[PDB]
mmCIF file of C-alpha atoms in Angstrom:
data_model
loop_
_atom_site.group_PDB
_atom_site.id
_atom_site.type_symbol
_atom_site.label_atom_id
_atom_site.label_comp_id
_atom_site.label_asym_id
_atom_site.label_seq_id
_atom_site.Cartn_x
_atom_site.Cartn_y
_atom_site.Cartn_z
ATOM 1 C CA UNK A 1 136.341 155.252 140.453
ATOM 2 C CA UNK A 2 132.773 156.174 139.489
ATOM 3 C CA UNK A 3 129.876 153.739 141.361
ATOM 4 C CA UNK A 4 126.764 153.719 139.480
ATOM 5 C CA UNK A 5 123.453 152.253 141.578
ATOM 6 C CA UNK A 6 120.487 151.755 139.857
ATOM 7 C CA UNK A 7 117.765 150.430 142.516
ATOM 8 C CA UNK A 8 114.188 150.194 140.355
ATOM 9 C CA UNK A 9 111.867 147.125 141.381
ATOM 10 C CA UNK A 10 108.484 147.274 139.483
ATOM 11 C CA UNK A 11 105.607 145.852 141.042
ATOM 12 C CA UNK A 12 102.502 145.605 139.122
ATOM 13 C CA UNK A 13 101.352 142.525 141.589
ATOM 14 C CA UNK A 14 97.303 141.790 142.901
ATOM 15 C CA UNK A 15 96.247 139.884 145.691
ATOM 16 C CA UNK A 16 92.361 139.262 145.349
ATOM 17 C CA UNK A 17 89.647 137.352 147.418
ATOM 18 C CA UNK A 18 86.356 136.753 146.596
ATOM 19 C CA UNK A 19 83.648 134.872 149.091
ATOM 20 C CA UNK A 20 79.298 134.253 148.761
ATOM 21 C CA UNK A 21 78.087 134.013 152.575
ATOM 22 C CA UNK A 22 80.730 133.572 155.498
ATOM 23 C CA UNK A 23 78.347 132.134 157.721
ATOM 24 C CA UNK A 24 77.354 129.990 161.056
ATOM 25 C CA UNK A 25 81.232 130.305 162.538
ATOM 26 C CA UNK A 26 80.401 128.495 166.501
ATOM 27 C CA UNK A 27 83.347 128.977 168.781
ATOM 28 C CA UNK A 28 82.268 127.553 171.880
ATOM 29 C CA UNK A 29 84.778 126.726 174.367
ATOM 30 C CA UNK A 30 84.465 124.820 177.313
ATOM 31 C CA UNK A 31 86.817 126.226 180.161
ATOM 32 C CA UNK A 32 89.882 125.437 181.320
ATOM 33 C CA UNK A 33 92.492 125.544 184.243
ATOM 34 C CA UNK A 34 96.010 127.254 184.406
ATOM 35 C CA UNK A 35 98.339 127.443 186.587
ATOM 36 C CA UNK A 36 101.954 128.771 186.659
ATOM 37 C CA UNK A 37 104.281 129.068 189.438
ATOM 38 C CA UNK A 38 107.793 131.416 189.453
ATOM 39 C CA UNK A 39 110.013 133.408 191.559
ATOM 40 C CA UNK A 40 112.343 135.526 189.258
ATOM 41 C CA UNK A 41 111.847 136.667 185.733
ATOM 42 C CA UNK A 42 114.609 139.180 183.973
ATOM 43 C CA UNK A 43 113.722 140.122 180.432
ATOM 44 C CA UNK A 44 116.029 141.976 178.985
ATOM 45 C CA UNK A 45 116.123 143.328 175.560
ATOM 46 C CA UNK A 46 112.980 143.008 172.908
ATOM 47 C CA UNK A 47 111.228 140.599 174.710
ATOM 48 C CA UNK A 48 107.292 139.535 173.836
ATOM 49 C CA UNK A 49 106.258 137.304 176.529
ATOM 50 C CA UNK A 50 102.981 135.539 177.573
ATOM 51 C CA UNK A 51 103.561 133.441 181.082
ATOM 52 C CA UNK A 52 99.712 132.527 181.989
ATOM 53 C CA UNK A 53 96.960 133.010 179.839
ATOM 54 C CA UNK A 54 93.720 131.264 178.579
ATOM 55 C CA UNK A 55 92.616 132.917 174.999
ATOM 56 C CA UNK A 56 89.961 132.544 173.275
ATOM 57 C CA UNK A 57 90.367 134.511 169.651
ATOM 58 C CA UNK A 58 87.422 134.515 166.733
ATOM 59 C CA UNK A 59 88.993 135.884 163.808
ATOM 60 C CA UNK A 60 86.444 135.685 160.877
ATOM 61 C CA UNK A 61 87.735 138.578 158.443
ATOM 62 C CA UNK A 62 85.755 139.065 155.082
ATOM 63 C CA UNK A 63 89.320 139.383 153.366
ATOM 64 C CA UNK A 64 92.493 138.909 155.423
ATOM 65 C CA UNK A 65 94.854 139.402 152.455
ATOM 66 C CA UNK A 66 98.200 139.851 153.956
ATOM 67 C CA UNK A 67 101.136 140.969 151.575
ATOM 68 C CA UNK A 68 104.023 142.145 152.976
ATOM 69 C CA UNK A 69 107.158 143.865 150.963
ATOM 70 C CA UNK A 70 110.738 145.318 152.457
ATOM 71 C CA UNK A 71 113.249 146.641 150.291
ATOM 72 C CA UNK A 72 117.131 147.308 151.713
ATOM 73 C CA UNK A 73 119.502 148.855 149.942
ATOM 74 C CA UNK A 74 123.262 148.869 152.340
ATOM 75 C CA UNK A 75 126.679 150.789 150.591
ATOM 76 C CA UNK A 76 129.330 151.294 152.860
ATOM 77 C CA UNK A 77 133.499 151.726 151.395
ATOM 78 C CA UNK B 1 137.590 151.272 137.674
ATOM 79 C CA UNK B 2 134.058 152.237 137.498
ATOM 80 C CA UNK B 3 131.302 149.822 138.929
ATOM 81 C CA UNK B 4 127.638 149.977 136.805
ATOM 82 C CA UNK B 5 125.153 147.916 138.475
ATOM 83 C CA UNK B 6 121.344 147.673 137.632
ATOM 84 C CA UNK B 7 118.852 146.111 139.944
ATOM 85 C CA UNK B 8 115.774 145.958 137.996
ATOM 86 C CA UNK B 9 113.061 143.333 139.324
ATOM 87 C CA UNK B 10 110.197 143.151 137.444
ATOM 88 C CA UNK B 11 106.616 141.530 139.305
ATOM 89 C CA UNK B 12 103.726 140.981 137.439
ATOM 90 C CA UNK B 13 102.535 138.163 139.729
ATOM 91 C CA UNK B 14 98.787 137.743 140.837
ATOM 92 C CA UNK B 15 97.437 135.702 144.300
ATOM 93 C CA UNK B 16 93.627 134.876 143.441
ATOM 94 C CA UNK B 17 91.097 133.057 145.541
ATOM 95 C CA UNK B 18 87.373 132.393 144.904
ATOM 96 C CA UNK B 19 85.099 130.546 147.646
ATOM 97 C CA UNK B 20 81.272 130.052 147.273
ATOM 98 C CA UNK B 21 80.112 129.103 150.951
ATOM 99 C CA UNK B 22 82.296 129.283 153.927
ATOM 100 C CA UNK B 23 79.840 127.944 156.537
ATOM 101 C CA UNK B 24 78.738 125.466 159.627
ATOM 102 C CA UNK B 25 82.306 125.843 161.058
ATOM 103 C CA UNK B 26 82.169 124.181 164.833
ATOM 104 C CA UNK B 27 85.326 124.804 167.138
ATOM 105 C CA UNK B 28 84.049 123.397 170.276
ATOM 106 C CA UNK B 29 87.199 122.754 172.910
ATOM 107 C CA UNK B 30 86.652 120.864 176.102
ATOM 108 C CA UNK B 31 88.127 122.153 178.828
ATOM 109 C CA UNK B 32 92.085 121.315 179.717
ATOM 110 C CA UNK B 33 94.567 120.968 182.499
ATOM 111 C CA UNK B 34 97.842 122.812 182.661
ATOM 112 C CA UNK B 35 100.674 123.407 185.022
ATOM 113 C CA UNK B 36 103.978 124.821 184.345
ATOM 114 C CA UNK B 37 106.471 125.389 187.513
ATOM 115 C CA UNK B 38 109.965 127.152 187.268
ATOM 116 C CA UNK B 39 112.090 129.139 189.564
ATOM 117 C CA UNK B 40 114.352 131.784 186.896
ATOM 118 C CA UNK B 41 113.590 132.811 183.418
ATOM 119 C CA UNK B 42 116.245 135.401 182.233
ATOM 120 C CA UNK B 43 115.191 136.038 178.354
ATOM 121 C CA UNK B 44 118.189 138.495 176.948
ATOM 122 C CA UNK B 45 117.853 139.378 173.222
ATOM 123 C CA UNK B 46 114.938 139.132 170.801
ATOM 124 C CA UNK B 47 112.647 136.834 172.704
ATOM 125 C CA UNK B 48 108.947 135.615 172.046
ATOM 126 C CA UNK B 49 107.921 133.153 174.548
ATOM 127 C CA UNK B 50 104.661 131.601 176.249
ATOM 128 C CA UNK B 51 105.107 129.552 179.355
ATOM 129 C CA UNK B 52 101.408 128.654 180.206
ATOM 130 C CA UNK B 53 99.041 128.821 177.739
ATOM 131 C CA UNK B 54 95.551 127.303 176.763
ATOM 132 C CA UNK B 55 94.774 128.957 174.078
ATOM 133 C CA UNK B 56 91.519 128.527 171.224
ATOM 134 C CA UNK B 57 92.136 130.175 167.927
ATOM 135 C CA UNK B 58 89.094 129.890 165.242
ATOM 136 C CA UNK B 59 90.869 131.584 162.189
ATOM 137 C CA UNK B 60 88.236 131.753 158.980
ATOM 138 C CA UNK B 61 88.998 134.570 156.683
ATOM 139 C CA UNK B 62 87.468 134.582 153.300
ATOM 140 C CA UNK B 63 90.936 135.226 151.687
ATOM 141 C CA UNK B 64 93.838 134.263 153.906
ATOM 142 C CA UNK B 65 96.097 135.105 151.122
ATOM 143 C CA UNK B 66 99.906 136.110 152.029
ATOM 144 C CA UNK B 67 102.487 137.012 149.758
ATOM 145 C CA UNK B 68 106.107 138.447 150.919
ATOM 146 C CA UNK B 69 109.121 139.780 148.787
ATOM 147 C CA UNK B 70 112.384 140.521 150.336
ATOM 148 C CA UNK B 71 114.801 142.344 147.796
ATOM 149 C CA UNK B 72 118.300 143.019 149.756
ATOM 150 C CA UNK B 73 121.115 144.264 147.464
ATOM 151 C CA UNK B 74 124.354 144.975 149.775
ATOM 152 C CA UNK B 75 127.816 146.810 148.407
ATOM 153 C CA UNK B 76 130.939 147.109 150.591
ATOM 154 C CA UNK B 77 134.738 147.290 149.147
ATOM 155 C CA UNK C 1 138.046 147.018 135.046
ATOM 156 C CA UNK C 2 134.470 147.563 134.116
ATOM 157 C CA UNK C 3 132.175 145.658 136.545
ATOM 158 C CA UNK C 4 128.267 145.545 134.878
ATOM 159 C CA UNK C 5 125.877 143.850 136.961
ATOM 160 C CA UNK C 6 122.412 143.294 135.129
ATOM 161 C CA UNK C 7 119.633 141.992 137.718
ATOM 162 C CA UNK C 8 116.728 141.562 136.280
ATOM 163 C CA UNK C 9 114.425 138.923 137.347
ATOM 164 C CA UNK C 10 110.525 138.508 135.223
ATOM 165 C CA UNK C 11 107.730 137.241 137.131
ATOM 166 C CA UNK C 12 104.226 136.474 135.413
ATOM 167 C CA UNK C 13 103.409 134.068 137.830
ATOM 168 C CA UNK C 14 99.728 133.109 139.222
ATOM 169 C CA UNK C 15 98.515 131.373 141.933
ATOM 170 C CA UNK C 16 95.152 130.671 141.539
ATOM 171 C CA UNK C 17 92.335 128.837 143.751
ATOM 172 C CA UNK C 18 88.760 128.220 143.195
ATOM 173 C CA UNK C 19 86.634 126.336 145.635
ATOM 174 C CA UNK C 20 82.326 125.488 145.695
ATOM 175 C CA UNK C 21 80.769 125.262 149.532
ATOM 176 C CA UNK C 22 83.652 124.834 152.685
ATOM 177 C CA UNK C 23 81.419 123.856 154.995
ATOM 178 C CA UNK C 24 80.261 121.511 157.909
ATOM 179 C CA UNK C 25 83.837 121.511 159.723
ATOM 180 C CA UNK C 26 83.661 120.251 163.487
ATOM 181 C CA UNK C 27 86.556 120.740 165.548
ATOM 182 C CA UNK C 28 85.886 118.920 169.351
ATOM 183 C CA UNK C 29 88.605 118.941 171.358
ATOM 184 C CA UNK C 30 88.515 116.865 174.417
ATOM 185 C CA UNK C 31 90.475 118.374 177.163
ATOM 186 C CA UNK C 32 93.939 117.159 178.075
ATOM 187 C CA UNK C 33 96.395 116.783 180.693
ATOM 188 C CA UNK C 34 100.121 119.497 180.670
ATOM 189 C CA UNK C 35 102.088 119.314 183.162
ATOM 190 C CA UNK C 36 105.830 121.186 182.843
ATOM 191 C CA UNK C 37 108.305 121.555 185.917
ATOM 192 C CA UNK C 38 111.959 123.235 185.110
ATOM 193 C CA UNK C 39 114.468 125.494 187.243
ATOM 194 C CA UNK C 40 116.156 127.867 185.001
ATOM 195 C CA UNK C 41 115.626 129.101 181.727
ATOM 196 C CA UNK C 42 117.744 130.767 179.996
ATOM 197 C CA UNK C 43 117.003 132.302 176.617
ATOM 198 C CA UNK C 44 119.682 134.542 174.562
ATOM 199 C CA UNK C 45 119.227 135.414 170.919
ATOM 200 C CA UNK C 46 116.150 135.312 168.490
ATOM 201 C CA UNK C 47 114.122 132.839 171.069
ATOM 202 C CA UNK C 48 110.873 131.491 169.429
ATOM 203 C CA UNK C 49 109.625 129.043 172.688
ATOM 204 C CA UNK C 50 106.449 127.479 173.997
ATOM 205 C CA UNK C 51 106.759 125.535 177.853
ATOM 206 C CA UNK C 52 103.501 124.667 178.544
ATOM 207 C CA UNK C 53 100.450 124.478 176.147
ATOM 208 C CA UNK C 54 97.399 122.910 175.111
ATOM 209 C CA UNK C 55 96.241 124.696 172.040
ATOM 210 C CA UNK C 56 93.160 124.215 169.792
ATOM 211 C CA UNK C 57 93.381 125.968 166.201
ATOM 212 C CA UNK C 58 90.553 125.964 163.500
ATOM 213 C CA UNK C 59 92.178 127.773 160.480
ATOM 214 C CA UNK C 60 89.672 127.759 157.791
ATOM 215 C CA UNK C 61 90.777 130.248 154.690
ATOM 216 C CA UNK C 62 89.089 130.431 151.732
ATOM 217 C CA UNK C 63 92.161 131.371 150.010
ATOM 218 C CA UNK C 64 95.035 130.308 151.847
ATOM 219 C CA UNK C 65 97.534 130.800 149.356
ATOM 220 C CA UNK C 66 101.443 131.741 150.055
ATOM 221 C CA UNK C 67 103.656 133.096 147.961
ATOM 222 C CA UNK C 68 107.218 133.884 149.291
ATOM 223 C CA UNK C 69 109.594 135.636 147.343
ATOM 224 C CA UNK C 70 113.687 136.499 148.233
ATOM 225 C CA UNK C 71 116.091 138.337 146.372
ATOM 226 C CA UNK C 72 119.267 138.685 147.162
ATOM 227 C CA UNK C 73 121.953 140.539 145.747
ATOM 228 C CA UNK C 74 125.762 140.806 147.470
ATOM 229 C CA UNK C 75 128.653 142.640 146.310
ATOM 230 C CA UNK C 76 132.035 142.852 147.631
ATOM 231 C CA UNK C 77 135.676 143.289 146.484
ATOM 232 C CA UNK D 1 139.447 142.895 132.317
ATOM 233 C CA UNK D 2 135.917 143.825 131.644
ATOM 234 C CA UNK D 3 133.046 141.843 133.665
ATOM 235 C CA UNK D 4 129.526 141.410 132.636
ATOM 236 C CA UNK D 5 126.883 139.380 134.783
ATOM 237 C CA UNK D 6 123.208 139.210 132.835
ATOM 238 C CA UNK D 7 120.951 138.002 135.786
ATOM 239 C CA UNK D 8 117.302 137.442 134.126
ATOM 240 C CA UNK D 9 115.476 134.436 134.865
ATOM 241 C CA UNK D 10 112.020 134.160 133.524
ATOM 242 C CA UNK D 11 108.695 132.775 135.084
ATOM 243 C CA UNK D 12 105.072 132.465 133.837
ATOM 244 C CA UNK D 13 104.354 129.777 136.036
ATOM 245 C CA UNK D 14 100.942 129.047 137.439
ATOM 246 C CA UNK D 15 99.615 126.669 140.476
ATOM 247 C CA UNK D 16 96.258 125.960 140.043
ATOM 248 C CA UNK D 17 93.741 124.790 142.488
ATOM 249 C CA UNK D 18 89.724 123.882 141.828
ATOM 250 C CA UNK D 19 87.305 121.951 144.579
ATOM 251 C CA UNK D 20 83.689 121.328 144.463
ATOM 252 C CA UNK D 21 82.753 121.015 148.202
ATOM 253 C CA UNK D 22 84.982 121.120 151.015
ATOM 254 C CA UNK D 23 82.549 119.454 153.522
ATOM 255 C CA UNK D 24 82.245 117.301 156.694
ATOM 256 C CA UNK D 25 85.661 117.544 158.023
ATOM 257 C CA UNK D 26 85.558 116.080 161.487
ATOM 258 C CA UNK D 27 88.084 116.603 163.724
ATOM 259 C CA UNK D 28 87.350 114.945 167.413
ATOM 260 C CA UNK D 29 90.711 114.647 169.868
ATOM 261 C CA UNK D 30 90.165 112.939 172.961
ATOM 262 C CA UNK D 31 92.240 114.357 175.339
ATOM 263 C CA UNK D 32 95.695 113.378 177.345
ATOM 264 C CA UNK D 33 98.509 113.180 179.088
ATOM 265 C CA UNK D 34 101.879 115.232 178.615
ATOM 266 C CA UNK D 35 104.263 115.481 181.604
ATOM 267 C CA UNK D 36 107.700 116.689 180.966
ATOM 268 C CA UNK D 37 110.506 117.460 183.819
ATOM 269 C CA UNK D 38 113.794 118.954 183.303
ATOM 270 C CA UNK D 39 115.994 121.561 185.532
ATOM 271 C CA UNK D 40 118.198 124.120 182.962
ATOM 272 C CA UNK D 41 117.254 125.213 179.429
ATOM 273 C CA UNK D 42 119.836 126.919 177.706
ATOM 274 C CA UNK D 43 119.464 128.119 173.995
ATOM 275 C CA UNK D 44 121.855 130.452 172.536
ATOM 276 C CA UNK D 45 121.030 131.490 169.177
ATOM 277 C CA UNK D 46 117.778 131.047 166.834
ATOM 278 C CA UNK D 47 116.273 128.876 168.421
ATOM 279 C CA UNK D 48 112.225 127.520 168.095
ATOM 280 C CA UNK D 49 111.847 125.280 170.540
ATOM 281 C CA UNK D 50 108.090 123.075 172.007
ATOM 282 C CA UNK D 51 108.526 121.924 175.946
ATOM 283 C CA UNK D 52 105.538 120.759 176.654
ATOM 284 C CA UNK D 53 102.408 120.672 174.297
ATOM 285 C CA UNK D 54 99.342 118.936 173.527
ATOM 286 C CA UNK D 55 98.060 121.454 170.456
ATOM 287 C CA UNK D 56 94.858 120.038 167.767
ATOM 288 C CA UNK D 57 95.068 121.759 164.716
ATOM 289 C CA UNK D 58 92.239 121.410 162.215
ATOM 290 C CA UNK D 59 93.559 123.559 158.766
ATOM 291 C CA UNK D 60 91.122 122.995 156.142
ATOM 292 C CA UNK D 61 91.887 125.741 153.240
ATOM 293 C CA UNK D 62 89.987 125.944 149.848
ATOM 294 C CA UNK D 63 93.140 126.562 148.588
ATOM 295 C CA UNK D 64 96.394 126.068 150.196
ATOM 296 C CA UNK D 65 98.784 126.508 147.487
ATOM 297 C CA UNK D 66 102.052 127.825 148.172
ATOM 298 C CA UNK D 67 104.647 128.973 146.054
ATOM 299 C CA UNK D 68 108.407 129.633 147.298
ATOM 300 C CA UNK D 69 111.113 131.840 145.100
ATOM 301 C CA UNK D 70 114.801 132.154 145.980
ATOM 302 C CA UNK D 71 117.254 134.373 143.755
ATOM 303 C CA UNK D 72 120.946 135.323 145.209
ATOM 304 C CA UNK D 73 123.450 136.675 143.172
ATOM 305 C CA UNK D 74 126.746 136.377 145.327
ATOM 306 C CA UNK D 75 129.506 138.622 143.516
ATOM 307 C CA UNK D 76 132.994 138.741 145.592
ATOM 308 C CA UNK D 77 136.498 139.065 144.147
ATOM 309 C CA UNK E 1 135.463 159.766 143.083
ATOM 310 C CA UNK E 2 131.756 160.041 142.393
ATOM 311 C CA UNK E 3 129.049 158.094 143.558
ATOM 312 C CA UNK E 4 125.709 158.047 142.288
ATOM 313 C CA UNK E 5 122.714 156.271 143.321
ATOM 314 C CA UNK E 6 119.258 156.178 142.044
ATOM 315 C CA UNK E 7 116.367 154.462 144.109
ATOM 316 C CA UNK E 8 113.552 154.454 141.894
ATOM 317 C CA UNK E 9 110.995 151.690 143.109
ATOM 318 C CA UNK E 10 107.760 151.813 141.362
ATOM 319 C CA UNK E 11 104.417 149.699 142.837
ATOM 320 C CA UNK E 12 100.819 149.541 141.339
ATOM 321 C CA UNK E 13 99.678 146.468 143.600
ATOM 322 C CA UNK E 14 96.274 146.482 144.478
ATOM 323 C CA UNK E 15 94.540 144.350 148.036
ATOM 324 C CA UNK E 16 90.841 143.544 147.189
ATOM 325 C CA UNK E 17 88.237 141.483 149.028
ATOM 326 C CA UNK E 18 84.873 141.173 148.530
ATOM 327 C CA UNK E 19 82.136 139.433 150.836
ATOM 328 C CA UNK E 20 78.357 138.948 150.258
ATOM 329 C CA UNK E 21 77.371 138.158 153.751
ATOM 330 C CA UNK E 22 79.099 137.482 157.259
ATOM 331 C CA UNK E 23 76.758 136.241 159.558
ATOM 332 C CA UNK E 24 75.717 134.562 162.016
ATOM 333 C CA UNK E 25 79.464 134.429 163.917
ATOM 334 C CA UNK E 26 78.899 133.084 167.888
ATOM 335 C CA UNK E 27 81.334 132.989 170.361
ATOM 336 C CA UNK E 28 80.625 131.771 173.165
ATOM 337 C CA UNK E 29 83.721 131.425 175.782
ATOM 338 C CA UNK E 30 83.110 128.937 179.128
ATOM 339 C CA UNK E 31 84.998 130.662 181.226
ATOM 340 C CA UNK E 32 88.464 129.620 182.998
ATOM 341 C CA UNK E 33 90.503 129.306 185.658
ATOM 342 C CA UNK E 34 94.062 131.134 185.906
ATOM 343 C CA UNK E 35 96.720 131.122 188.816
ATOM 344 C CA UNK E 36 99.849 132.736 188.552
ATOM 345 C CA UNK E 37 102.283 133.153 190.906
ATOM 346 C CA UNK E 38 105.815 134.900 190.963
ATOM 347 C CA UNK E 39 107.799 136.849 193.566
ATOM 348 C CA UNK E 40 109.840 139.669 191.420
ATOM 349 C CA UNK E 41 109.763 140.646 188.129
ATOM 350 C CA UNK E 42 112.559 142.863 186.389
ATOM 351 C CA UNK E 43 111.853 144.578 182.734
ATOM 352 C CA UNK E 44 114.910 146.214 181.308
ATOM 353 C CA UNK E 45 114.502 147.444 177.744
ATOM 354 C CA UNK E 46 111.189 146.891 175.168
ATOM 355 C CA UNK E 47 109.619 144.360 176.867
ATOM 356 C CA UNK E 48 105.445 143.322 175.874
ATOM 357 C CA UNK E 49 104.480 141.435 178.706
ATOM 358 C CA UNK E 50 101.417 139.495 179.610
ATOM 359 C CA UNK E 51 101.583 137.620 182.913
ATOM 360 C CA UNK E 52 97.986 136.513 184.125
ATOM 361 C CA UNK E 53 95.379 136.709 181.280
ATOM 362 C CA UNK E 54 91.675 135.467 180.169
ATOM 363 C CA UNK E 55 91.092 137.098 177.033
ATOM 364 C CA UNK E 56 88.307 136.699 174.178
ATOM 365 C CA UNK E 57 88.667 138.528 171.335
ATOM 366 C CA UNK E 58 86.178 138.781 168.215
ATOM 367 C CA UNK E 59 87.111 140.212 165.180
ATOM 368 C CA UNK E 60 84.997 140.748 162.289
ATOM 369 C CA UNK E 61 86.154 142.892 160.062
ATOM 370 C CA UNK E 62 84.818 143.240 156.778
ATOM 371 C CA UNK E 63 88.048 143.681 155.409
ATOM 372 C CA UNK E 64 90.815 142.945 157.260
ATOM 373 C CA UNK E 65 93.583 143.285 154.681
ATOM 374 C CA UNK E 66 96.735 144.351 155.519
ATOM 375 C CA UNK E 67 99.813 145.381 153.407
ATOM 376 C CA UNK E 68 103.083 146.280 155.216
ATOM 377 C CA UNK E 69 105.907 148.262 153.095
ATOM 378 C CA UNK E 70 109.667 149.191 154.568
ATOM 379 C CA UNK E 71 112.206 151.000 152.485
ATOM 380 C CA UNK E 72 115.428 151.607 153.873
ATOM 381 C CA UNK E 73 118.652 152.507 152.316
ATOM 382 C CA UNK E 74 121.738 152.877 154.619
ATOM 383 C CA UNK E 75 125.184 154.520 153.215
ATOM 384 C CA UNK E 76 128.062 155.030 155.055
ATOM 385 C CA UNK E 77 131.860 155.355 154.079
#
């Protein structure tokens, strides 16, 4: 028995942005206090972990145009 | 018995965005108070985790624009 | 027997935004108070967790806009 | 016995978005009190879970607009 | 038996941004206060980790746009 496949995705897609003035972006924080108490941690397999933190991110991007593709093609008999 | 299949997708899609003034943002946090006790964390398989966290995120793009396609095409007898 | 599978999906689709002045956003947190307390914790498969937070975010995108496609094709006998 | 599957939607949609001034967006928390106490979290399998939180989120996007496809073709005999 | 498969995807997308002016971005971070305490700690396999953290980040890119692609075609009999 003859199997015949034919994968073809066309992607003619656009993802634009356009801004004037990104401008006068305060981030001020104002402290903070943390505190975490533990004895035993076991990670194990694929592990992203964050036990104590204080973070302070500015994240002013002119574009930030995210576009994400994935394409899966499985055969098995 | 022979199997034909076609897998043709076609994307002609567009994301647009047009801003004039992104300005006079204020992210001005105050301070906090946190406390996180445990004894045993055992995390196994595909974890993300945060156990303390005080965290200030000022996030201003001038696009911000996400787009995601997932094309999966699975064949087993 | 003949099996003919045609897949073929046609997008022309926009999404389109348009804005004049963002502007004059104040974001003033006042502090705040967490307090966990646990013994064990134990996480297995695809964990998405948070124990103790106090988070501040100012997302301000000029675009902003999502677009999520999926498809999904499965064949078996 | 012959089968023949023709899978072709169609889509010119379009979601359209158009603001003259985003402006004084004022976003003032003031503050709190979360205490939570517990001795053995167990989660198995996709799980998203929030303990303990106190989280101010100001999202003001000039657009915002989001757009969610689903196609699945599910072919068995 | 024969087996033939063709995996033909085709993709003319296009990520643009454009900007006039960022300016005038100030962060300004209060400092913090973070205690963490543990006794042992056991990583096995792929593990990101961040145990006692005060982090300020800020990013200003002019562009920022990211575009993630993943092909993958598995066959097995």
């Amino acid at each position: 028995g003859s199997v015949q496949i034919v994968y073809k995705p066309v992607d003619l897609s656009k993802v634009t942005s356009k801004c004037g003035s990104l401008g006068n972006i305060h981030h001020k924080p104002g402290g903070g206090q943390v505190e975490v108490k533990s004895e035993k941690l076991d990670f194990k397999d694929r592990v992203q972990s964050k036990i104590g933190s204080l973070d302070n991110i500015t994240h002013v991007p002119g574009g930030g145009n995210k576009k994400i593709e994935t394409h899966k093609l499985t055969f098995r008999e």
